Symmetry: D2
Subunit: 250 residues, 4 copies
C-alpha cells in the first residue's frame, strides 16, 4: 500500500511542485486548495492519469476563525477517507502581503489571514494529523529571511516566526509517537505574480549562488529529503534553501 500525503495550497507554484514530487516518489496525495479550483482539479487529473486513484482535491479556507479547527480536521479526514492513512503533512499554504504599522481589509481580518494561514492552521492540522494516528512526518514551509524581514510585513513575519516555534514544539512533543517535524525555509523562490520584471531582477541579483531564485522543484527536493528514510533521525530541523541569500549583509 502506497503512503499518503496532505499538501496545503497545492494547486499552484511551490505546493504544486511538492505534490508532484511526492506523487513521483510513490505517495497518494490530497491537493488542498482555497480559490484555485480549476488548477487543483487539473493537477489531480494529471496525477490520476499517471496512476488511478492516487490524487484527490480538498477545498478549505485556512483563515483563522472559530471553524478553522473543523476545517483542519476535515482536511486530515479527507486523506483517511480517500486513502485509509495519512503519513505526511506539508504545511505550505500562506498569505503574504504588507501590514504597515503606521498609516480594504480590517486589521482583524489581516491577523486572521496572515497568522491563520501561516501558523494557526499548521498548528490545528498538526493536532488533527497526530490525533488521527512506519515513517510519519510533517514539513512546514518557513522563511529563510525571518530575521532580516521585509519592511512593513510585521504580521507575515510574526506568523512565520510562530511557525518556527510550532516546528520545534511539535517535534519535541510528537517524537515519542514517531512523528518527525521539520521545516524548509526558502529565500527567494517563485516571485510574486503582481511584481514587475525590473524588481524581480533586483532580487535575483542579491542571491550569491547563481544570481537567480529557487525553482519550485528545488524547494520540493528538500521536502522530499525530509520525508524520506534518509532523514529518520532528523526532527526539529529547518533547512534553508536560499542560495546564500540570508548570509548577505545590507
Amino acid at each position: 500500500e502506497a503512503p499518503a500525503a496532505v499538501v496545503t495550497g497545492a494547486a499552484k507554484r511551490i505546493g504544486r511542485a511538492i505534490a508532484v514530487k511526492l506523487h513521483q516518489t510513490g505517495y497518494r496525495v490530497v491537493i488542498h486548495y482555497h480559490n484555485s479550483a480549476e488548477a487543483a482539479v487539473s493537477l489531480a487529473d494529471e496525477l490520476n492519469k499517471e496512476r488511478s486513484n492516487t490524487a484527490v482535491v480538498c477545498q478549505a479556507d485556512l483563515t483563522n476563525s472559530n471553524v478553522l479547527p473543523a476545517s483542519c480536521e476535515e482536511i486530515i479526514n479527507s486523506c483517511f477517507r480517500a486513502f485509509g492513512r495519512c503519513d505526511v503533512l506539508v504545511n505550505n499554504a500562506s498569505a503574504f502581503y504588507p501590514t504597515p504599522l503606521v498609516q480594504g481589509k480590517t486589521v482583524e481580518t489581516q491577523v486572521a489571514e496572515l497568522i491563520g494561514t501561516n501558523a494557526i492552521a499548521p498548528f490545528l492540522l498538526t493536532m488533527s494529523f497526530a490525533q488521527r494516528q512506519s515513517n510519519l512526518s510533517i514539513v512546514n514551509l518557513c522563511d529563510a529571511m525571518v530575521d532580516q524581514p521585509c519592511m512593513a510585513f510585521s504580521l507575515y513575519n510574526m506568523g512565520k516566526h510562530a511557525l518556527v516555534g510550532l516546528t520545534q514544539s511539535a517535534a519535541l512533543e510528537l517524537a515519542p509517537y514517531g512523528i518527525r517535524v521539520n521545516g524548509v525555509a526558502p529565500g527567494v523562490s517563485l516571485l510574486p505574480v503582481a511584481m514587475g520584471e525590473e524588481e524581480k531582477d533586483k532580487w535575483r541579483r542579491k542571491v550569491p549562488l547563481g544570481r537567480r531564485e529557487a525553482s519550485a522543484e528545488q524547494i520540493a527536493d528538500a521536502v522530499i529529503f525530509l520525508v524520506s528514510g534518509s532523514a529518520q533521525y532528523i526532527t526539529g530541523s529547518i533547512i534553508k534553501v536560499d542560495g546564500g541569500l540570508s548570509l548577505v549583509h545590507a
Copy 2:
C-alpha cells in the same frame, strides 16, 4: 515634563516591578490590568502617594477578538489623556498554560488567549503607540527558553516566537521615527506561589548563576536599561536575563 509609560499586566509580579522601577526613574505610568483590579488600584495609590498625579489604571482583556484593536487604541489613548504623551510601551501581559497536541476551553479560545496576549495585543499596541506620535521605545517581554520549550506548550511558544518577530519587524519599521524596539527574555523568574517549594527547587537548581530564579526587580533592571539614554543605539535586541539557564543542555 516627566515622560510617561504604559505597562501591560502591571498589577502583579514582573509587570508591577517594571511599573515601580519606571516610576522611581521618573516616569508617569499607566498600570494596565485584566482581572487584578484591587492590586492595580493599590499600586496606583502607592505611586500617587509618592508623587501626586503620576499613576492611573486601565482595565482591558487582551485576548484576541473583533474589539481588541479598539481596546489597544484605548490603552494608548489613556496615557495621552492622563499625561499628554506616551514615551514608553512595555508589553508584559501574558497568558501561559499548556495546549497539548494529543488528547474547559475550546482550542480557538486558547488561540485567542495565548496568541492574543503574547503577540497580537503587542502588535496592536505597537501600531497605536507609533500612530499616536525625546527617547521613545518599546520593550517586549520575551522568553529565554523559546528554542528549548516546555513540553506541550506549543501555542504559548508560538506566541513568544511571534513576539520575537514583532520585536525585529517593528524595530526595522519604526527606526525612521526614532522609536527603538527591544526585548527582555527571562529564564525562570517568579515562580507560581502555589507551586510546591520542592517543585520550585527543581527549577532553581537548573540555573547556573546562583541556583535561584530571577527576581522581578532583576527583570525590571534590564527594561530600565533599554528605555534609558544608555541604550539609545540599541534596537531590535533581545537581552536574556536568565542566569545562564538557556545554555544548559538536557
Copy 3:
C-alpha cells in the same frame, strides 16, 4: 566520468560511514587518516574490491603548525593526482576533550589540536580545494549542541563555533565559483570508546526521537543529500541530525 571526494578522518566511525556512502553513490574517495593507517587501508581494500582503483589513502596530521598549510594542500592534491578532479570535501576530522578554565598537554598544544583540527585545517582545506578548481561542494561536520555546550569544553566549543563561521563565510565567498558550503550537525551519534555504558545510556534517554544515538549512517545520509543534485540551491545551511536533542531544556 565519476566524481571524487576527500573525507578527513575517514578510517573510523562517522568519517568511515561517510566514505562508504559516498563510494556507494558512485564517488571515488580519498580516505584521510592521521594515526589509523591499518583501518584506512582496510577501508580502501573493501571499496576497491567493490570497484577497482576507486579509493586511495592519505596520511596527514591536522594539528595546527607551520606545516599544516602544506599538509592540507597535499590532501587536496592527492585527490587530483589519483582521480583528476575533486568535487567534494568533507571536513569530518576532529579532536574532542575537555579544557577546564580553572585548574599532560600544554594549553597551546590543546589550542593547536582543538582549534587546529576542528577549524583551521577545514579553513586551509577549503582554501586549497577552491584554489585547485559540475556539482562542487564542501560539507563541514558541525555540532548540534554548539549553543548548549558540554561543561569544561570551551576550546572544543570555540572550534565548532569557528567552523560555523567558516561554513557561512566560505558559502558566501565561494558561491560565485559554484562551490556550495554546508554543514551537518550531529547531536549524540557514536559515543566515544572511552565513555562507560551507564554514561552512554544516560545520554540516550534524553533524545526525543527513540531514546537512542544516531548511527553513523544517519549522519552520512545528510552529507549525501547535501552533495547531491537535490541540494543544488542549498549553501550556508547547517542541517541538525540530533533526534531533537537540542530542543530539550535542562
Copy 4:
C-alpha cells in the same frame, strides 16, 4: 576600596571609551596596548590627573604563540600588582583584515593574529582572570554581523564566532564562581581610520536607527551596564548595539 578592571586594546577608539567610562564609574583601570604606547601613556596620565594612582598601562602582543599564555597571565597579574584585585576583564583588542580564500603575511601568521587576538587571547585571559580569584564579570567585544559576514573575512569571522562560543562556555563554567560572562556586539561603530568618507557614508546609510555609526560611548554604555549591579542575573548574553543593522536584508 575601588574595584579594578583590565581593558585590552584600550589606548584608542572603543577600548579607550570603555576604559574612560569604567574610570568615570569608579574603577581603577589597566590600559593594555600593543603598539600604541604614546596613546596609552597619554590616557593613563589623563586618568591619574583626575584621580591619582587609578590607571596603569600594560604592553602585550596578543597574537597566538607558545608565550601567549604567559602574556595573558601577566596582563591579569599587572592588575593585581597595581591595585590588589581584578574585578572586571574587557576583551576588546582585535585584529581585523581580509583573508581571501581564493588568490606580506604568511597564512599561519594571519591565523595567529586573527584567531589569537579575537579568540585565543580572550580564552587565556579568561583562564587567568578566573584562576587569580563582589561583582566579578567579563565582557567580550563581539560583532553583530557575525552571521552576515564581510566578503573575504573568513578568519576574522571564525575568530568572532569562536568568541561567541567562549562567551557561552565560560558563562556556564564560571557561573558557580560568581563570575558573569557576557558580550557586546557592535554593528558599525568607529569606522576604520584609513577608510575614506565616501565609503564611510555607504555604511552609515545602511543603519536604520539614525543612518549613522555607533559612537564609542554608545558601545561603552552597554559594557557599563553589563558590569553593573543592574545586570547581576545576566550571564551568557550578547547585547547587540547596532542601530538595527543586522535586521536589514540584502
